[PDB]
Amino acid sequence: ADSCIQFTRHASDVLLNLNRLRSRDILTDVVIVVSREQFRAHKTVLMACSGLFYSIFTDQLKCNLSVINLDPEINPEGFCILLDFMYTSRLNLREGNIMAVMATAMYLQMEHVVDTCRKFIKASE
Amino acid sequence: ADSCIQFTRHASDVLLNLNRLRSRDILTDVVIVVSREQFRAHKTVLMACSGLFYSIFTDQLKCNLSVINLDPEINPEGFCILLDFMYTSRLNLREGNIMAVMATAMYLQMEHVVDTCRKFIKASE
């Protein structure tokens, strides 16, 4: 209908609870491997935040995998920062990690993150 | 860190994508049965929005069930309205459904919905 009321904080409260489930390893259904590092997550949150994971988990074979191995060129800290952003809306962007975060966001297909990385780099030129 | 930047629309964009996955029946992992009606959903979204589903899906046996049957006194339209609220932040509250929505929200343990129902009822007294 068009007569709905809306609870402003609902979406951010849902995301907070999804991150609490991730911290406690509750109903996590995939491990993402980035070289020597493993990250447990929920496939639905990954798909909802990344064009690459949306493609992977809508594929009729890959949707059933419990482990996904990323390209060896992907930096684990860059992936960790982006996984935290997926679950919190907060991006820990620093001079020492911006190149790795931007490269990881291009690979994961996260256009808003790629945008703010490009803007922060351009401001330092 | 404390030096994060934040993307304002991220949480609402995640919730929109979770609702699109639900509409397309992508990676839904539970069917909620409410008398004669069935509703497919993602356990993590249900837990993130409801004290009852949080208790059910953190139980070591019930976490593995693919079907959950609700109490026969629960109204299917009331449940449908609340499931749509879980996935959108929008509550279709009307004179003809408020009693069923409030009863369903009390059973599901959704305190903000119970609150606005009580306020709308009190305004009509």
Partner: peptide, 5 residues
């Protein structure tokens, strides 16, 4: 919270 969206 609640608002008219």
């Amino acid at each position: 919270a609640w608002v008219i969206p």
